Amino acid sequence: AYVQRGAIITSDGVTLAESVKQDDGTYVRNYPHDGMASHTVGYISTQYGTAGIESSMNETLTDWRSALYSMAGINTTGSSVVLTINSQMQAVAEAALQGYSGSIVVMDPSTGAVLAKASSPSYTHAELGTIIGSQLVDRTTQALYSPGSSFKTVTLAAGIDTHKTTLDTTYSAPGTMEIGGGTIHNYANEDMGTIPLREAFARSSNTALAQLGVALGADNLVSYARAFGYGTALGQDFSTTPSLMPNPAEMTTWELAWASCGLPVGEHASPAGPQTTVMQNAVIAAAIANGGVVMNPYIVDRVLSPEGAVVSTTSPKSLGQAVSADTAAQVREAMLGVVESGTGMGARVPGVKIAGKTGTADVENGNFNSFFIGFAPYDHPTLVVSVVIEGNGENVLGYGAQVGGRVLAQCLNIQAL
């Protein structure tokens, strides 16, 4: 502890972590704006473990002289870390989760840079010096959720990219339908008649999208999911638990039908899926917004020497092209429909074209979660949002979309400055 640890700063210059020298000789870790991006800034605690940047960039932040403790402070001084996080967007995301459990990720679609990353409930660093699904879980990257209908984005992308369907192709979308010996149902058993795929997607018909998933087959469904990041521990410089899909060979038709609507119901050796992180949902939206090119997200922009010189800069890196540019353009158009006339009207913001996909998924004892992935502006997107609002007793139907749209609009205004 005699070696001064480097600082952690936002892209807009807000210091979130500093080490301060003491007369004693040692350094104490200070956290200005304590409470901001806590899970991302992280900590090193005996009781609570290690997390975030303090942990992952520990060496950067962290010979004859080594044998002398009195000289530790002299030779080495840790380098600082500038994050991609913008403090104003981070504040926007934190304000939007007040009163709720869940998370939000805002990301640049062309690079995968994480501009805001918020999990709720959260905590302060002061609180770690006391006794405390807890606040410590990072719901953006280390909690897995059934994505529900937000995953239809992947089903749609795969259907179009394999040239098995088009947005104007019609589908029967009844209230209930037998598939693989089990029943699939639209929400509220709504019978929508025969409708084009773009409308089945905007209105989020499970019966229609399940039919597409069965037409694709398990290999295709899983393969496309993986091409968007499933099975990868996303993040160049932060830890994300991989999103999961089953071994396609173990899937049944009924399982496949539900999986295509974002509900993991499989029973077999491999995991049931899809199970997703919010960060993964953001990566999917970004890929779609970025002409199909998937980017490995990152949260460190650059590293600075104690003197203030740039030691290294992170380079954006692609995880591949999951779908063609033509496919991505069709998926974007379908997502515009979700917001302009479908289940995502709550995301609309006057004067800006926002596109996205909603989902709602049942969890334990009558609880359900609301999801939204989206991007803006529709034409030439410069931001992507991914949201989950956990209901845990409260009815949060459509909340993801409302939070998502509000966050995108506020972040676009910040970008314009």
Ligand SMILES: *C(=O)[C@@H](NC(=O)COc1ccccc1)[C@@H]1N[C@@H](C(=O)O)C(C)(C)S1
């Ligand atoms: C996708 O998520 C869909 N979900 C369902 O039909 C199951 O939905 C619910 C579970 C619990 C409580 C209420 C609904 C279809 N898409 C949803 C969406 O948010 O887009 C939906 C509610 C419109 S139906």
